[PDB]
Amino acid sequence: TLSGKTPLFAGSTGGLLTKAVEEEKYAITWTSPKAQVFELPTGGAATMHEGENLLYIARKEYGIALGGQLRKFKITNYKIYRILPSGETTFIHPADGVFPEKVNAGREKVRFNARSIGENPNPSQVKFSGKATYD
């Protein structure tokens, strides 16, 4: 499903280790208007192609970091995918196609506490219970 040619000068010792084969791997795709030089997540000046680029990355933070650099190149169409050893590619960023800093209807509040941080219980109150003070 992941289309895009690997950028030129993409090679370095900072690339994928055995984790990429055994645990999980990430990909970041983006469409460039023009072939241009960009710093790789783990060092080395790579060259983007005009059109679809595919870069495999060890960590999602590499994708978000590179994403931030692509924004400085006026590129906001970058998609990060998590890839499992079974070849189960999962589109993970942006989750719902809209960037998380922009508000999108349909998203529900997760881990919201309807109180000020000062109104948390004391650790003594939740002692020998399953719950924590921030629950």
Partner: protein
């Protein structure tokens, strides 16, 4: 394009307004203080000109003006040293009796009993004995009276004035444009040919016409008053002919290539003058003449305005091979668009040069009555090693600052810099390994030896009398350098240094220099040096190579050069910044150089320095205990630190008492540093909260809210007091010891 003088006129109007506006230079600081962090940030950012303005031209002008400022303060200092020589010294007494009189150029005022520090230094003079070697410098210069020092001091104050004016003028009044600054080919030409070449030719002039004659007469035992003034050797040729017959020939032999006619005042003697135990002035003369010619030739390499010459960009671009992709392409842009890239280079290589100077000056003492002044010898070696080590770490810092701030991917794609970034894991992993290998097979041998000696098994030790580790290569090189005169250096009489071999040379009763034999203790300590240098490089190289990113922090360049961490996540990211690698490299630089100056101190005192019997038997200062003692840590603790600290700890109620106070004071400052290094900001901010509560309670709470130092400042203050305390301790130790035994 053509190198030319192009300046803006009246770029910055001179006014005290901004003197009354602390932090004017930074937009953030300009708003004013809200917390005490502001006061630190003011000083921290003061000379960080890249953060003042984006304009490279304005930065270049600030740097050029600041340099005139630093030249002015260094000239004020050098003028002060010479003035203190002219007014408050026993220089003239020391000239009359170099071997007996002790150099002193600092007299203390009689107040709170500190006049005790004005000890009997000889020449009916009371003052602090100086270890800077200024007297040996001035004797080498051919200065024979206080008036010549007064003239030189005043001349210096005028030059310092000129340097101040220059800095004001070249910033406020006629500031060069960026075009001017980026003439690297013209700058190299002028700095090779005029600064170094004409400076060396000029100095050859002074040596040949003033120093060599005056020193030759002083070595012939002629009274200082009886010696003619330096201008009398020019005005009265007959006096100069009598010392150097070659001057009879005049200047025609120079122009007709009959240079052998100057063989008497331009020599290749080698070794040392037996009277003074310093290098021959005639050798030094020929050196500076030969240097001058090579420099004046060298500085016609780079193309300026006449087509002839190299462009450095084309040289760099052409040097590429099958391992290095584009090779040195793009490095010209790095070194001509980044001041940090130039400062990195210049600090790394000036630092490396200062350490070479340290080594070359002890082994080949260039000044008269330096070699036998064991206090001066130890102190100038140690001093220049320290300056060297700090400059090298500065090189690494500014290399990392360049990588974070001024590194461009576009300029540096598939070049040597780009390709080192791409195998930085392979570089650091291998350097990590060689550090552990050297650590085990250098330090582990000391631990082996300590344990064997402790278990009553000296036969099982790594020693000359047990399992030998002879430095055969260094031993072989010493031999080659000893056989050089007459052989592979036919026109040399003696070796370059008696350290390599030849005889014991002695001046007065004392050894100037003798062969420095290398054995198991010298093999072990050399592999300790290799270890401690490789670990410092591991830290600093890791700092520069991982400044922009790592497998842990991909966007480290965005966090900047100097940030404390990226939080307790990822297991904890404390001290990942390039700044924090410099911080850690300073401790290892300190650890490394400490063992270098300790090595030098003990080896020279045990195996080189000492008295010489009429028969010719050498009685060393610590009686050659290095070979058997310096192969265990216990031997270093006992026979070096414990043994030689006796003078500094027993100095109270004497002229050396100050070193006893400095010794404790420095131990204190060092220990104080551990408060900053071992603790964290969080604790101190919470303590300040309670103290601020009490000030609030009595309505003395300051408007500038007190804050605990930044995480980075905590570390900066830590390493500052640690280095100050540690280095100052050894300084007090070395002085008190060597001013007693040496």
């Amino acid at each position: 394009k053509k190198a030319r003088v192009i300046v803006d006129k009246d770029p910055v109007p001179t006014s005290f307004e901004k003197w009354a506006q602390p932090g004017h230079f930074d937009r953030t600081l300009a708003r004013g203080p809200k917390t005490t962090t502001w006061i630190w940030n003011l000083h921290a950012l003061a000379h960080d000109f890249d953060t003042h303005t984006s304009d490279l031209e304005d930065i270049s002008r600030k740097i050029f003006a600041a340099h005139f400022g630093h030249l002015a303060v260094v000239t004020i200092w050098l003028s002060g040293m010479i003035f203190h020589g002219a007014k408050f010294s026993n220089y003239e007494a020391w000239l009359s009796d170099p071997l007996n009189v002790r150099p002193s150029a600092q007299v203390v005022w009689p107040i709170v009993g500190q006049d005790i520090l004005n000890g009997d230094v000889g020449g009916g003079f009371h003052g602090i004995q100086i270890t800077s070697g200024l007297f040996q410098v001035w004797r080498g210069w051919g200065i024979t009276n206080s008036f010549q020092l007064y003239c030189t001091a005043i001349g210096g104050l005028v030059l310092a004035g000129l340097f101040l004016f220059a800095g004001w003028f070249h910033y406020h009044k006629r500031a060069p444009k960026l075009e001017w600054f980026q003439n690297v080919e013209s700058m190299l030409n002028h700095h090779l040919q005029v600064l170094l070449g004409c400076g060396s030719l000029g100095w050859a002039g002074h040596l040949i016409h003033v120093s060599a004659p005056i020193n030759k007469l002083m070595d012939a035992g002629v009274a200082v008053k009886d010696i003619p003034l330096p201008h009398e050797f020019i005005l009265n040729k007959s006096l100069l002919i009598d010392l150097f017959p070659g001057f009879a020939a005049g200047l025609t032999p120079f122009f007709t290539l009959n240079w052998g006619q100057y063989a008497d005042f331009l020599t290749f003697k080698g070794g040392l003058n037996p009277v003074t135990g310093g290098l021959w002035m005639t050798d030094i003369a020929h050196h500076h003449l030969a240097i001058a010619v090579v420099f004046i030739i060298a500085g016609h390499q780079y193309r300026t305005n006449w087509g002839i010459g190299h462009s450095i960009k084309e040289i760099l671009e052409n040097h590429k091979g099958p391992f290095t992709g584009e090779g040195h392409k793009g490095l010209y842009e790095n070194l001509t668009t980044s001041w940090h890239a130039q400062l990195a280079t210049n600090l790394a290589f000036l630092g490396s040069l200062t350490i070479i100077i340290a080594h070359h000056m002890y082994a080949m003492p260039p000044y008269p009555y330096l070699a036998t002044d064991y206090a001066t010898q130890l102190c100038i070696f140690t001093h220049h090693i320290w300056i060297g080590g700090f400059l090298i770490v500065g090189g690494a810092a500014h290399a990392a600052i360049f990588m974070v701030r001024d590194y461009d991917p576009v300029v540096n794609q598939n070049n040597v810099l780009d390709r080192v970034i791409r195998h930085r894991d392979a570089i650091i992993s291998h350097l990590n390994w060689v550090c552990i290998f050297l650590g085990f097979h250098s330090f582990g041998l000391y631990i082996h030896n300590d344990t064997m000696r402790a278990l009553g098994r000296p036969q099982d030790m790594f020693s000359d009398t047990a399992i030998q580790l002879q430095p055969v290569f260094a031993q072989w090189v010493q031999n080659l350098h000893t056989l050089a005169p007459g052989g592979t250096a036919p026109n040399a009489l003696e070796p370059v240094s008696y350290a390599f071999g030849g005889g014991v040379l002695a001046v007065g009763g004392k050894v100037a220099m003798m062969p420095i034999a290398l054995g198991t203790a010298d093999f072990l300590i050399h592999h300790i040096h290799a270890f401690t240098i490789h670990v410092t490089v591991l830290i600093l190289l890791k700092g520069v190579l991982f400044a922009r990113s790592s497998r842990l922090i991909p966007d480290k360049a965005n966090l900047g050069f100097r940030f404390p961490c990226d939080g307790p996540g990822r297991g904890g990211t404390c001290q990942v910044s390039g700044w924090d690698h410099v911080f850690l490299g300073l401790f290892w630089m300190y650890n490394s150089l400490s063992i270098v100056i300790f090595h030098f101190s003990w080896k020279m005192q045990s195996d080189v320095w000492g008295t010489v019997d009429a028969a010719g038997n050498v009685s060393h200062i610590t009686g050659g205990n290095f070979a058997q003692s310096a192969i265990t840590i216990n031997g270093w603790l006992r026979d070096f630190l414990w043994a030689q600290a006796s003078q500094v700890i027993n100095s109270y109620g004497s002229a050396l008492s100050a070193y006893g106070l400095m010794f404790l004071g420095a131990h204190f400052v060092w220990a104080f540093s551990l408060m900053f290094l071992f603790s964290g900001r969080g604790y101190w901010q919470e303590l300040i909260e309670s103290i601020v509560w009490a000030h609030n309670k009595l309505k003395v709470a300051p408007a500038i809210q007190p804050r605990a130092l930044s995480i980075t400042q905590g570390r900066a203050v830590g390493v500052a007091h640690y280095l100050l305390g540690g280095i100052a301790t050894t300084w007090a130790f070395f002085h008190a010891h060597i001013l007693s035994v040496g």
